[PDB]
RNA sequence: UAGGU
């Protein structure tokens, strides 16, 4: 089969390229909850209508 | 006379909202008595107000124009790393419009459908810079029918306040480094 | 309920 061979004829050119699931982001800012909400889920606080969206 | 014309998803069209068909998002929103129909099927999600431009911040009147690059570089960097994780991504676009339903609103479009239902179904219930995310799939297919063609040569002359898409491009340097790291990413999974 | 077919 001619796939495993065009595989490895792409991993060859793309030997000095980080894949993007190794990519180290200094400050990522997810998964970041403001104070106090460690506990409270994302569902719940949408709900509290303490995060509104600018249309409302 | 080779084929019949239709005005579907236009501004002729009086019961669908065109500006939801083509852009994502009405100014008027759920109280518009035009229709704006919400795919069950698509490639595209939306996460409005997920990019706060620190330029409309009570104190982001502080920093350079290569420090407001490298921030906004930061972002995109931030974003399409995530988005990678629920499949191929093939564009990212993020609105620069301070209109309230276009302000900060984030577009992806991945290859497959069933790629941008897992993603919706997992951002919303993650949270992104203390506040929680908002995502839903957006009707949008073409890019360039719901960006604004003024914009794109010098500036729009409505600013801001502009109800097409104003996408903040980021640099060619962090564009090519991510198609270039999603297409390694996705061969190193397809050899097994 | 618009500027964009
Ligand atoms: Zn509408
Ligand atoms: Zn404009």
């Given at each position: 089969?001619?796939?495993?061979?065009?595989?490895?004829?792409?991993?060859?050119?793309?030997?000095?390229?980080?894949?993007?699931?190794?990519?180290?982001?200094?400050?990522?800012?997810?998964?970041?909850?403001?104070?106090?909400y460690?506990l409270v889920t994302a569902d719940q606080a949408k709900m509290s209508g303490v995060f509104p969206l600018?249309?409302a | 006379?080779?084929?019949?014309?239709?005005?579907?998803?236009?501004?002729?069209?009086?019961?669908?909202?065109?500006?939801?068909?083509?852009?994502?998002?009405?100014?008027?929103?759920?109280?518009?008595?035009?229709?704006?129909?919400?795919?069950?099927?698509?490639?595209?999600?939306?996460?409005?107000?997920?990019?706060?431009?620190?330029?409309?911040?009570?104190?982001?009147?502080?920093?350079?124009?290569?420090?407001?690059?490298?921030?906004?570089?930061?972002?995109?960097?931030?974003?399409?790393?995530?988005?990678?994780?629920?499949?191929?991504?093939?564009?990212?676009?993020?609105?620069?419009?301070?209109?309230?339903?276009?302000?900060?609103?984030?577009?992806?479009?991945?290859?497959?459908?069933?790629?941008?239902?897992?993603?919706?179904?997992?951002?919303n219930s993650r949270w992104?810079?203390?506040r929680p995310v908002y995502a839903?799939?957006?009707?949008?297919?073409?890019?360039?029918?719901?960006?604004?063609?003024?914009?794109?040569?010098?500036?729009?002359?409505?600013?801001?306040?502009?109800?097409?898409?104003?996408?903040?491009?980021?640099?060619?340097?962090?564009?090519?480094?991510?198609?270039?790291?999603?297409?390694?990413?996705?061969?190193?999974?397809?050899?097994?």
């Open positions: 089969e001619r796939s495993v061979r065009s595989i490895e004829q792409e991993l060859e050119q793309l030997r000095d390229v980080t894949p993007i699931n190794q990519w180290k982001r200094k400050r990522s800012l997810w998964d970041i909850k403001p104070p106090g460690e600018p249309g | 006379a080779s084929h019949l014309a239709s005005i579907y998803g236009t501004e002729q069209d009086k019961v669908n909202c065109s500006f939801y068909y083509k852009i994502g998002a009405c100014r008027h929103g759920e109280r518009c008595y035009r229709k704006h129909v919400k795919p069950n099927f698509s490639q595209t999600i939306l996460c409005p107000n997920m990019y706060k431009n620190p330029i409309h911040e009570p104190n982001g009147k502080k920093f350079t124009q290569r420090e407001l690059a490298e921030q906004f570089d930061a972002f995109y960097e931030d974003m399409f790393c995530e988005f990678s994780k629920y499949g191929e991504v093939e564009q990212l676009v993020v609105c620069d419009n301070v209109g309230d339903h276009l302000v900060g609103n984030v577009y992806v479009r991945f290859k497959y459908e069933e790629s941008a239902q897992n993603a919706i179904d997992d951002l992104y810079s203390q839903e799939l957006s009707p949008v297919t073409d890019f360039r029918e719901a960006c604004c063609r003024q914009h794109e040569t010098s500036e729009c002359q409505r600013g801001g306040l502009c109800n097409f898409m104003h996408a903040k491009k980021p640099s060619p340097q962090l564009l090519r480094d991510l198609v270039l790291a999603q297409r390694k990413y996705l061969a190193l999974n397809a050899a097994e």
